[PDB]
């Protein structure tokens, strides 16, 4: 909506979408022993 909210991930795409798709596959495989999930912000939009 606003280019500064999409940059700071107030709105826009979730972490499955704006991150590099290899980092999503890395965090999906190493999740049980090295969690990268809380390092990235998911926008929830009403």
């Amino acid at each position: 909506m606003m280019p500064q909210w999409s940059y700071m991930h107030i709105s826009g795409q979730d972490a499955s979408e704006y991150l590099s798709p290899g980092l999503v596959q890395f965090a999906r495989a190493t999740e049980t022993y090295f969690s990268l999930n809380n390092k990235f912000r998911n926008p929830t939009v009403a």
Binding site: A15, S16, G22, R28, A29, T30, T32, N37
Partner: peptide, 28 residues
Amino acid sequence: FASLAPRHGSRPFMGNWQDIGTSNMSGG
């Protein structure tokens, strides 16, 4: 990245795709 995942059987035990980021705030 199946060489980083533990093997339950012979399939890589991967997480979900959309479980990458956090979204929790003080009531939102």
